[PDB]
C-alpha cells in the first residue's frame, strides 16, 4: 500500500502502455497514484479518451491489481496482421512504436476478414479492458489499412453495447497525424462475456487488468 509512482507519465500513459512509461507490472496494490497529470505521455496517437476522469477515480486506490494478457499477441489474430501496427506518432528508442497494452491490427495480405473475439471473465474480479478505434484521414488509407470501405466495430458486454463507424476526414495535424484514434475503457463483471467484432479500424486489447478496489 505504498503509492503508485508513474514518474513523468500520467494515468492514461501508464494504463495504455505508452512506450515512454514504465509498466509497473509488479504493482499489485497502491494507496494512491503519484502522477504528472500534464504529461504528454498519455496518448501519443491523437484522439479522445472517453470518460478519462471516471477512470482516474476507478484506479485511485486498489487493494488487488493484476495485469494479464487477455488476447495473447502471437496467437489471438491468425487471420489479421498484428505486426505492422507501429507509427511515427508513437516513437520509442529511435524507432516507430505503439502502445504496450493495445495492438493496432491491419489487414493480412489484401483481405480483412470479419474479426470476432470473446473473453469470459474467470478472474472473480472486475476486469478493466481498454481498446481503441482508429479513424483514417482519407479513403485511401482506409483501404490500405483495412481493405473494407464500410468497416464497423462492435463492442458488447453486460453493461456496454456500441457499434463504431470510422469517421474519415482530414483533420488538423496533431503530432503530425491527420487521422485520429479514440480510446475507450470498460469494466467486465465476474462471469460476463465481452465480444469484439470488427471489419476494420479496431485497436485490440493485448493486456487487461483484474482489479479489486480500496475503499473502506
Amino acid at each position, epitope marked *: 500500500s505504498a503509492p503508485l509512482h508513474l514518474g513523468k507519465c*500520467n494515468i*492514461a500513459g501508464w494504463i495504455l502502455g505508452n512506450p515512454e512509461c514504465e509498466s509497473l507490472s509488479t504493482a499489485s496494490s497502491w494507496s494512491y497514484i503519484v502522477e504528472t*497529470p*500534464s*504529461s*504528454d505521455n*498519455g*496518448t501519443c496517437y*491523437p*484522439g*479522445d*479518451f472517453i470518460d*478519462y476522469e471516471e477512470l482516474r477515480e476507478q484506479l485511485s486506490s486498489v487493494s488487488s491489481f493484476e495485469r494479464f494478457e487477455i488476447f495473447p499477441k502471437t496467437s489471438s489474430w491468425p487471420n489479421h496482421d498484428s505486426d505492422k501496427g507501429v507509427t511515427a506518432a508513437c516513437p520509442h528508442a529511435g524507432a516507430k512504436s505503439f502502445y504496450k497494452n493495445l495492438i493496432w491490427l491491419v489487414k493480412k495480405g489484401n483481405s480483412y476478414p470479419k474479426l470476432s473475439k470473446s473473453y469470459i471473465n474467470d478472474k472473480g474480479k472486475e476486469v478493466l479492458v481498454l481498446w481503441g478505434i482508429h479513424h483514417p484521414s482519407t*479513403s485511401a488509407d482506409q483501404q490500405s489499412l483495412y481493405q473494407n470501405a464500410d468497416a464497423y466495430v462492435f463492442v458488447g458486454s453486460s453493461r456496454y453495447s456500441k457499434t463504431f*463507424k470510422p*469517421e*474519415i*476526414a482530414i*483533420r*488538423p495535424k*496533431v503530432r503530425d497525424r491527420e487521422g*485520429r484514434m479514440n*480510446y475507450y475503457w470498460t469494466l467486465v463483471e465476474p462471469g460476463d462475456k465481452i465480444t469484439f467484432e470488427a471489419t476494420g479500424n479496431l485497436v485490440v486489447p493485448r493486456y487487461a487488468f483484474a482489479m479489486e478496489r480500496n475503499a473502506g
Partner: antibody
Amino acid sequence: EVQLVESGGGLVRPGGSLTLTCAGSGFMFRSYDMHWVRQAAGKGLEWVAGMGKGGETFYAGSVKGRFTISRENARNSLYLQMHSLRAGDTAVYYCARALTEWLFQRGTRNHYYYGMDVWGQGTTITVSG
Amino acid sequence: EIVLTQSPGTLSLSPGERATLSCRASQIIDNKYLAWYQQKPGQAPRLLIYGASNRATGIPDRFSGSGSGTEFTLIISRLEPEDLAVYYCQQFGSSVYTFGQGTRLEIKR
C-alpha cells in the same frame, strides 16, 4: 469534388411551412457537424441552426421553437424544417460543414472547432402573401 | 449572448497596403473558438482563419489572424484587387454561433 447543394427554397405565406434540403458529396457526411446560415439581402451572416455528428441539435434564439434541423447520413442530406414563418425570415439560406473534436492532451479532454469549411451556393426563401 | 463588434465599418485601401481588421468581443473568448471569413461579391463565405490564428488550408500567407481575450485582428499584408470582399469574424459560445456585422474592404483606384 467536395460540394454542398441547397434546395427547397421558394415563396411561402406568412405563418406557413417549408423544408430545406442540403445534399453533400465528395466527403464522408457523418464525420462533420452541419449548419444552416442565412443572409438577408444586403445584410450580414446569421447562424440559425447546427447539428453534431451524433445528432444533437443547436439553434439560434431567433428561430428556437420554429425551425427543426435533422440529418440522414445515409442520404448525405441535411434538413431544415421551418414553420410559423415570419417576414423577417426572408433570406438566402446557406449550408455549411465543420469539424469539431475532443483531443486528449496534457491530461484533460479539450474541445476544438475548426471553422465552417465548405459552403453551399445558397437557396432563397421569401415570406409574403 | 456574445456580441462581436467589428471595425472599421468600411475600409478603403490601395493595392499593396496592409489591411488591419478588428473584431471585439463583448466578453472574453477562448482563442480556439474565434474564426474569420471572406465573402466576395456574389459568392458564398470562405473560411480564412480557425482558432484565432491558424490559416485554413489553401489560404495564402498574407492572411494572418492574431489576438486574445476580447480583441482580435485579421491582417492582409499585401492587398490585391481580388481581396475585395466583406470580412466576418465568428465565435463559438454557449452551444451557439454568432458573427460580426462585417467589414467592407474597398479597393482604392
